[PDB]
From Swiss-Prot, chain C:
UniProt-recorded name of the protein: Neurofibromin truncated
Name of the gene: NF1
Species of origin: Homo sapiens (Human)
Coiled-coil regions listed in the entry: none
Boundaries of the shown chain within the full protein: 711 to 994 of 2839
Source organism, top-level taxon: Eukaryota
């Protein structure tokens, strides 16, 4: 939403249609399931609590759904669609080159909590791969 | 079935005009011409009348059939483009059907089209609405036998165990080749109409609303059908993904508007409507009688040619306050005795407003309710005291009124000095309220309407109302005319004189006020204040007002 | 089938005779498919039979005499059940369902079809100590979910007139135990009748005016 209503950037009327359609998709029951908040009628209500000054939050229902690396692809490729649309207008943009470096750093470092997610993202956005990188990927599988 | 209903709509919507235009002239000759006089088109020996010679009946029936048969073949060009495409698809379907399987694809198409489209009109023209009055049974018999002979030609089948009609078998032999040419011409349309092009690209606003409503109702089920198939490629760029996204974006459809008219369906014609109203007891409803008092579409003397004149007052009809069918019956009832002969109709659109208007659906019915031949008997149409609002309405409803675009029968009174010459003075009975104005007050010639565009307008400050007459011609339905807006004095709620160069005239529910420039604005505003003040005395209680916020 | 296939042999060309000698040729073909189905109780089967019996569009000598001939048996059978102060009823139910689904063919003042309705409406309020309840429980079930869409314009007119006389002069309601039982039935019939969406029903609802009945 902030992208659609920013004055520093000047997006042509073609691009802004892409952004406004993406805004509608993310509120569909399809994407509520990907983010893991299915069975919630509205996201806003759960995010905020009215009596947040009087009492502290009381979390419960420790039962926690699982996450599947196939869901992360759908999210990781929806966001990549938005970013590229903007880069067409903004000349000599560096957004995609900065994101790739950040992902490429966690992909090849041992961390059992971030490495799986930082690999599904390195491949979904990267535009070039070399033999030296493939050797590492096949040796993380070994 | 669904496929069947597609044909019915296609033929009925476009075929009606083609059949009536062609068949109508032929029906006049047999029905009315003294030359035909009285003759029996019967060849049945059991029913054969000794008084009339069998040969005379047989030859006359054969001669009559030739007249109709020749007309059908000749009018190849008049075939609508829509049906031409419809025939080609069937031809390709049969041709493709033949390939996988001496049957002629054209033969099957020709017999089908003739049997379901041309044949029904000939057998019973009265039901189709071609003829107002049911043909006499003796004339009806000839049409029935005529259809059978014509149908045999398409199938190239001789008379077997049909000795009654066997003598006629000779005639069909010559015309077998002729029938083939007519079918081939329509069937010869290119599979892709690269050459035949008509980029009308009409908005069709009314249709779109129904489409959006239909999709919303079946949102869930239509999605499941797409989900089952299309696994080969992700549906993200395929209908199911787009449908959910777009449909959610638009939001729920708006509620449908109400229908003043009785329930109606595709199966509607002039004959059908007349019977329905007759069975209904509209005479004693006490709402039909009120129309007589309103004096709507009343006969008034005659014209230069001597044809009777009628005057329809736009003011007298409210958009929804009364059922629209009762007005139709009154107009049809009054025109029924005389509409056969040429007639002139004059429509009074003085002080037209959105309150008195015709909706898209209700407007269309007028084209069909009447028998159809009366439209050709429209000697002339005169429009008086038109205003800008009408022009805007015409642009939106151009599609329905495209037939009247550039119509010779439409006569526009550009200035008062023209109608008085053409119409019989001392007989025209234009509205008394209209006559009350009399356009007999001061004219501020060469006043300029300051706006996005400047148009010279002559303003008359009438005794009871203000008339703004444009001095620049406008194009309405392809005929030039000068717009003459009329604003009642009572409707002039606000009168502000911003400056001596121009004054402000705000009117109820008109958004931005009306500003004009004249060398003496205070003279104009002075009179308007005097005119407005006079009304205040006339009204019993002006103080009670407002209490309404838009 | 054997009645249909005889049509083809007599005249090979379909349109000329197969749809003229045997006007209801297309519907007859459907009867065969249902027969090739698993056997089930009479209730389940009667649903399919009454569906096909409702699609007989064209009047014919066979139809117009099967409907009238079975009507006379229906009338006399009813008197025995009522006048006398389970298998007998089961037959009575079947005749009514059949005699309703196939009403449209015999359509077209006093007439056999009209006289059927009058007796039918005078059974919705049938108070019979012995078996009265079962009669009303079933006449409501049939007239609602099974009547032929070609008889709606006639059902409303008789149902409306029956109501119109519940009000005396000067529009004062006449409370009665039976009249209150009749309206309770007219509500259940109309609800089911309107609820069901079937082919051809829409075109026929238009002819009649349901307003004056609802207001009363």
């Amino acid at each position: 939403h902030s992208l659609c209503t920013c004055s520093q950037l000047h997006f042509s009327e073609e691009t802004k249609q892409v952004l406004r359609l993406s805004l509608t998709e993310f509120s569909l029951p399809k994407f509520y399931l990907l983010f893991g908040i299915s069975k919630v009628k509205s996201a806003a209500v759960i995010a905020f609590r009215s009596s947040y000054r009087d009492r502290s939050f009381s979390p419960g229902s420790y039962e926690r759904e699982t996450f599947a690396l196939t869901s992360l692809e759908t999210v990781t490729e929806a966001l990549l669609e938005i970013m590229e649309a903007c880069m067409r207008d903004i000349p000599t943009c560096k957004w995609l080159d900065q994101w790739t470096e950040l992902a490429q750093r966690f992909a090849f470092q041992y961390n059992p909590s971030l490495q799986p997610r930082a690999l599904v993202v390195f491949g979904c956005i990267s535009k070039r791969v070399s033999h030296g990188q493939i050797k590492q990927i096949i040796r993380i599988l070994s | 079935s669904l496929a069947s209903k597609i044909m019915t709509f296609c033929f009925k919507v476009y075929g009606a005009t083609y059949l009536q235009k062609l068949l109508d002239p032929l029906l006049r000759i047999v029905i009315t011409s003294s030359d035909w006089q009285h003759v029996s088109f019967e060849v049945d020996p059991t029913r054969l009348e000794p008084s009339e010679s069998l040969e005379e009946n047989q030859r006359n029936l054969l001669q009559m059939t030739e007249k109709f048969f020749h007309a059908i073949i000749s009018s190849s060009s008049e075939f609508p483009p829509q049906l031409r495409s419809v025939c080609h698809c069937l031809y390709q379907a049969t041709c493709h059907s033949l390939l996988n399987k001496p049957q002629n694809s054209i033969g099957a198409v020709g017999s089908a089209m003739f049997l379901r489209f041309i044949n029904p009109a000939i057998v019973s023209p009265y039901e189709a609405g071609i003829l107002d009055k049911k043909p006499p049974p003796r004339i009806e018999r000839g049409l029935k036998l005529m259809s059978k002979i014509l149908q045999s030609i398409a199938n190239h089948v001789l008379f077997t165990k049909e000795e009654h009609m066997r003598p006629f078998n000779d005639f069909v032999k010559s015309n077998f080749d002729a029938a083939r040419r007519f079918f081939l011409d329509i069937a010869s349309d290119c599979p892709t109409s690269d050459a035949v092009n008509h980029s009308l690209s009409f908005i069709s606003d009314g249709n779109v609303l129904a489409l959006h409503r239909l999709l919303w109702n079946n949102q869930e089920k239509i999605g499941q059908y797409l989900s089952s198939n299309r696994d080969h490629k992700a549906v993200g760029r395929r209908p199911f993904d787009k449908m959910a996204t777009l449909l959610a974006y638009l939001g729920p459809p708006e509620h449908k508007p109400v229908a003043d008219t009785h329930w109606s369906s595709l199966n509607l014609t002039s004959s059908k409507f007349e019977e329905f109203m007759t069975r209904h007891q509209v005479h004693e409803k006490e709402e039909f009688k009120a129309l007589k008092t309103l004096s709507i579409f009343y006969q008034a003397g005659t014209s230069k040619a001597g044809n009777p004149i009628f005057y329809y007052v736009a003011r007298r009809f409210k958009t929804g306050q009364i059922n629209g069918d009762l007005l139709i019956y009154h107009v049809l009832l009054t025109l029924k005795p005389y509409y056969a002969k040429p007639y002139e109709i004059v429509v009074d659109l003085t002080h037209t407003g959105p309150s008195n208007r015709f909706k898209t659906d209700f407007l269309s019915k007028w084209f069909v309710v009447f028998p159809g031949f009366a439209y050709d008997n429209v000697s002339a149409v005169y429009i008086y005291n038109c205003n800008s609002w009408v022009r805007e309405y015409t642009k939106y409803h151009e599609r329905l009124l495209t037939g009247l675009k550039g119509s010779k029968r439409l006569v526009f009174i550009d200035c008062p000095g023209k109608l008085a010459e053409h119409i019989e003075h001392e007989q025209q009975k234009l509205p008394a309220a209209t006559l009350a104005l009399e356009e007999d007050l001061k004219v501020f010639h060469n006043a300029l309407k300051l706006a996005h565009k400047d148009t010279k307008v002559s303003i008359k400050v009438g005794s009871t109302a203000v008339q703004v007459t444009s001095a620049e011609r406008t194009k309405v339905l392809g005929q030039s005319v000068f717009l003459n807006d009329i604003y009642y004095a009572s409707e002039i709620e606000e009168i502000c004189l911003v400056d001596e160069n121009q004054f402000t005239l705000t009117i109820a529910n008109q958004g931005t006020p009306l500003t004009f420039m004249h060398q003496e604005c205070e003279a104009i505003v002075q009179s308007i204040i005097h005119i407005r003040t006079r009304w205040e005395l006339s009204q019993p209680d002006s103080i009670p007002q407002h209490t309404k916020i838009r | 089938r054997h009645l249909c296939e005889e049509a083809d042999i007599r005249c090979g060309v379909d349109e000329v005779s197969v749809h003229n000698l045997l006007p209801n040729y297309n519907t007859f073909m459907e009867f065969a498919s249902v027969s090739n189905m698993m056997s089930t109780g009479r209730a389940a089967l009667q649903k399919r039979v009454m569906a096909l019996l409702r699609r007989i569009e064209h009047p014919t000598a066979g139809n117009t005499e099967a409907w009238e001939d079975t009507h006379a048996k229906w009338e006399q059978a009813t008197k025995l059940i009522l006048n006398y102060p389970t298998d007998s009823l089961q037959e009575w139910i079947n005749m009514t369902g059949f005699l309703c689904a196939l009403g449209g063919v015999c359509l077209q003042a006093d007439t056999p079809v009209s006289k059927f309705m009058d007796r039918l409406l005078s059974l919705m309020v049938c108070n019979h100590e012995k078996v009265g309840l079962q009669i009303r429980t079933n006449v409501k079930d049939l007239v609602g979910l099974e009547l032929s869409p070609a008889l709606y314009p006639m059902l409303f007119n008789k149902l409306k007139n029956t109501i119109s006389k519940f009000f005396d002069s000067q529009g004062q309601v006449l409370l009665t135990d039976t009249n209150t039982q009749f309206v309770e039935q007219t509500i259940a019939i109309m609800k089911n009748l309107l609820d069901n969406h079937t082919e051809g029903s829409s075109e026929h609802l238009g002819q009649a005016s349901i307003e004056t009945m609802m207001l009363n």
